Amino acid sequence: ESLTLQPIARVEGTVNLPGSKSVSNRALLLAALARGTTVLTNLLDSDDVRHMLNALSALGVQYTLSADRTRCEVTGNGGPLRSAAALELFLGNAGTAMRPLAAALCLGSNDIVLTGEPRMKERPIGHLVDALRQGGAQIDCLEQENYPPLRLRGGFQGGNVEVDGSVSSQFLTALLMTAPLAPQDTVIVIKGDLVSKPYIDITLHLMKTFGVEVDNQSYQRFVVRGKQQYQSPGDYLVEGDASSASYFLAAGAIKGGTVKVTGIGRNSVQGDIRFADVLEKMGATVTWGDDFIACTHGELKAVDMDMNHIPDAAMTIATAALFAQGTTTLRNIYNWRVKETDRLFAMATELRKVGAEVEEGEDYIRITPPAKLKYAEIGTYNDHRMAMCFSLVALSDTPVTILDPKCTAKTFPDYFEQLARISTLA
Ligand SMILES: O=C(O)C1=C[C@@H](OP(=O)(O)O)[C@@H](O)[C@H](O)C1
Ligand SMILES: O=C(O)C[NH2+]CP(=O)(O)O
């Protein structure tokens, strides 16, 4: 399957964003654990959220979904999830299901196997397993240490644990969400650097919404009290996805017009709102509201930036760079290599097909645009963001053909229709 995007002369309009994947999967898990019934509004319907919903169903969590799957009423368990069955749960390639559930299912005495798609068995989890085992959990890595599939037999108590923060923030996120329900207090020491720090902020905001605080000592040590229970907030509004927003804001920066996204704004908890600052640095004009961000085209110039704070939206800069004057350098993005695909390899390979010169560094990418873009069929590596990032090539005089366009469904099933709504073809 393939989708050819014809050249787009102008983009403009307003996009009502689908829900945030990151917020959706945290909110579902916390609602499942909490005391009380939580009503989630603007929940994302996408593969990663569906895998979480299916796992929660299999684990006995009671919830209802609206017809469009964006409103979800969760009856909280008031405690750790429990199953009497020797289940195997398939989690696709959803890190925000696999990592949080691997920790949560270490509470108690279940016997559950977590698995997923082939790529998920190549995505690291050992830093999380190590910390959970230090806290008393029984875990078997059925194929190889540091990777799924995992057999979880429970037993997490708490105590003094160390977690490496240098590969994924999700390991720390998973520990933080599980530790409050453990029988003992947990002190989490971060071994070295912490990547993707804004996602830790999301986790802490969500936990606070659900009635639980922790002592964050400069992102280097966390003190969590055990014996707690999450408390439903009642209604909870899931923010629009700021990573999904990046494509539309960039499209405005490149080929607007003014493109406005709604459902996020200056006070959002998602770190990817900071992507708009990069477009501003490149020369676009950005306007902020409490519930919108808008971007208007101006002449674009390349940037050289550390992107560790926005690793997902950073991919959008890599293709927006094709429209900027000069060489763009994106630094401190090593964990691109351990995500839906090796994104440093994939982005460099596909950028070259449209004519860019690319230096693929170990943990950075340097992109020098060609004078004129070339027509290419873009491989997407079963990676939603490869498809969405390369859609921007069509904001030029050259079409682009996106292979396997349905991979956008990991986070954004209707991406191409939403892009078309704001596009005027040349
Ligand atoms: O916690 C989260 O919601 C996420 C954390 C990030 O992963 P890393 O911490 O591995 O960079 C990000 O890439 C992912 O899409 C969502
Ligand atoms: O969404 C992204 O760009 C990266 N997702 C990684 P996951 O959410 O599967 O851990």
UniProtKB/TrEMBL annotation:
Entry binding sites for phosphoenolpyruvate: 21, 95, 123, 170, 343, 385, 410
Catalytic reaction list: 3-phosphoshikimate + phosphoenolpyruvate = 5-O-(1-carboxyvinyl)-3-phosphoshikimate + phosphate
One GO molecular-function entry: 3-phosphoshikimate 1-carboxyvinyltransferase activity
Keywords: Amino-acid biosynthesis, Aromatic amino acid biosynthesis, Cytoplasm, Transferase
Compartments, record wording: Cytoplasm
Biochemical pathway: Metabolic intermediate biosynthesis; chorismate biosynthesis; chorismate from D-erythrose 4-phosphate and phosphoenolpyruvate: step 6/7
Protein name: 3-phosphoshikimate 1-carboxyvinyltransferase
Taxonomic placement: Bacteria, Pseudomonadati, Pseudomonadota, Gammaproteobacteria, Enterobacterales
